[PDB]
């Protein structure tokens, strides 16, 4: 009886980037997949994502 209208508005998105410093860096990881946690000049955690 219901109108099966609309659309499943997705919440998992695909993002495309390119290698361009100083905007986006590219670094190879460690030997166990997760790459090296580092710190800034202030000791703040440099947030990275697994590209």
UniProtKB/Swiss-Prot annotation:
Detected throughout the brain, in brain cortex, cerebellum, thalamus and olfactory bulb. NMDA is probably regulated by C-terminal phosphorylation of an isoform of NR1 by PKC. Its phosphorylated state is influenced by the formation of the NMDAR-PPP2CB complex and the NMDAR channel activity. It is found in: Cell membrane; Postsynaptic cell membrane; Synaptic cell membrane; Postsynaptic density membrane. Belongs to the glutamate-gated ion channel (TC 1.A.10.1) family. NR1/GRIN1 subfamily. A hydrophobic region that gives rise to the prediction of a transmembrane span does not cross the membrane, but is part of a discontinuously helical region that dips into the membrane and is probably part of the pore and of the selectivity filter. The extracellular N-terminal domain (ATD) is a site of allosteric regulation to modulate overall receptor function. Heterotetramer; the NMDAR subunits are modular and harbor tiered domains that function in concert to regulate opening and closing of the cation-selective ion channel pore. Forms heterotetrameric channels composed of two GluN1/zeta subunits (GRIN1), and two identical GluN2/epsilon subunits (GRIN2A, GRIN2B, GRIN2C or GRIN2D) or GluN3 subunits (GRIN3A or GRIN3B) (in vitro). Can also form heterotetrameric channels that contain at least two GluN1 subunits and at least two different GluN2 subunits (or a combination of one GluN2 and one GluN3 subunits) (in vitro). This is Glutamate receptor ionotropic, NMDA 1.
């Amino acid at each position: 009886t219901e109108k099966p209208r609309g659309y499943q508005m997705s919440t998992r998105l695909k993002i495309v980037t390119i290698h361009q410093e100083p905007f986006v860096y590219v670094k190879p990881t460690m030997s166990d997949g997760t790459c090296k946690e580092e710190f800034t000049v202030n000791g703040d955690p440099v947030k990275k994502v697994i590209c």
